[PDB]
Structure formats: structure tokens, C-alpha cells
Design a protein around this ligand. Sequence first.
Ligand SMILES: OCc1ccc(-c2cccc(O)c2-c2nnn[nH]2)cc1
Ligand SMILES: [Ca+2]
Ligand SMILES: [Zn+2]
Ligand SMILES: [Zn+2]
Length: 241
Amino acid sequence: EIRPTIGQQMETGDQRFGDLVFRQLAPNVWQHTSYLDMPGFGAVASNGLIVRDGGRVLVVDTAWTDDQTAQILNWIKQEINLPVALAVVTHAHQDKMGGMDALHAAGIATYANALSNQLAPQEGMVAAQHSLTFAANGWVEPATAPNFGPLKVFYPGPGHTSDNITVGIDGTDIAFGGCLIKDSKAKSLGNLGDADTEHYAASARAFGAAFPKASMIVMSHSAPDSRAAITHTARMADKLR
Ligand SMILES: OCc1ccc(-c2cccc(O)c2-c2nnn[nH]2)cc1
Ligand SMILES: [Ca+2]
Ligand SMILES: [Zn+2]
Ligand SMILES: [Zn+2]
């Protein structure tokens, strides 16, 4: 088994597929996990989502690499055998956007915050092909998110990065905090190199208020948790202000 240095371990309910791990979270939602083997450190796990919406599939976040992302597409083909309509990527960092080329080669429409697309070159990423824009209260402008089905995109404010976005899964009790949210037992807020330490706490709380009835909080670097992930993240961030 892959025992990452950072990120959750493999537990019962997990399926190893190639270099990745998949975990079913709901009848129509799965978590993908991929690993970056860092020099002198070991593997760092990162999570995204796969959502079935009738006769199509929707993806949230790439894996760290193009090859790993192609493996996600192979898993979908094997296990679901439905086409991927679109992918939403949650900010311009390698764990979320490192595999854009694999999505594009597959002909999948990609979406990111306009700011993520603007930052992508400096961050060493390939931009998504479509830009999401947001209202003053953080909700996505619906005309920029056409045919998103159950994906409800929310920009909570600057936190882990200035561009980080979040996604609620309508028709479920799941919401995805990406890298903004850390689990309820987290020791740190992770890599703060690109973070907005002033606004982080309010952004974390804004994500909780946007999806007030989501009981299963999915995040990039821990297993799914309760709403205490939101509260605990915000309390850690209160110390940065
Ligand atoms: O404390 C656990 C932990 C520590 C570091 C990361 C991380 C690693 C590389 C790039 C990164 O952007 C990150 C990162 N993502 N979210 N927060 N830090 C992730 C999780
Ligand atoms: Ca690439
Ligand atoms: Zn990041
Ligand atoms: Zn991350």
C-alpha cells in the first residue's frame, strides 16, 4: 500500500487503482486520491471528487500530474462507463490543476475561477478553458457555470490562496472545501506561502455558511470529516489575524 507521509492513509472502503485510491462517499459521489512523491519527504496525498449526474460524470480537481489524471479517467471508464461532461478545478496549484493537459486531451470542458486562470502561468499551471466569475457574496454567476447539475460553486474569499473556490454537491449532504479546509484534528493550516492570513478565518466561516446543512466536509488533504473541520480551521485561522 501507499502510506503517504502527509494526507490520510488507506482504510477499509478504499479501492487502489493504479497509483490512485478511490473511496465511495455516496451512491453518486466518489473521492479520488493521488500522491506526489516529494524529494526527501515521501508521498503527499491530495483529494478530489467524481460525481455521477444521470448519464454523465462531473469531476472536481485534477490529480497532481497528467498521468495520474489520465488514471482517474480510466477508473471512471471502468467503474462508471459514462462520459465526463466537465471538470471544476479549485485553485491554481499543482495538487488541483497539475493534470489539466490530461483533461484537455480527453476533450473534457474545464472550468476554474477567472483569477485561477489568470494566475495559472505564474503558478506553473495550464489554465482551464472556461472562467467562472463570482458575485459580491461569493456565489458563482450562473451564466459562467452552464449545465453544472448538482455542482454549486462558491468563492468564500481569500484563504489558502486568493483564488480558492469550494463546491457543494446538491442532492447530497456533501460539500468540498478543497485546500481551504483542514480536518477537525489538524495541527496546522498547511502551506501558507500563498495564503491571505488576514481573511482566512472569515473565508473558512463563509464556506460553512454557504453550505449550512452539509454534514460531510470533503477536503484536499484529510479524509472526509464533520463540520468541526470548518470550525477548527476557522479557529486556527483566528490566530493568524
Ligand atoms: O498539514 C498537512 C499538509 C501540509 C502541506 C500540504 C501542501 C503541500 C504542498 C503544497 C501545498 O499547497 C500544500 C497545501 N495545500 N493546502 N494547504 N497546504 C498539504 C497538507
Ligand atoms: Ca501538464
Ligand atoms: Zn493550494
Ligand atoms: Zn493543497
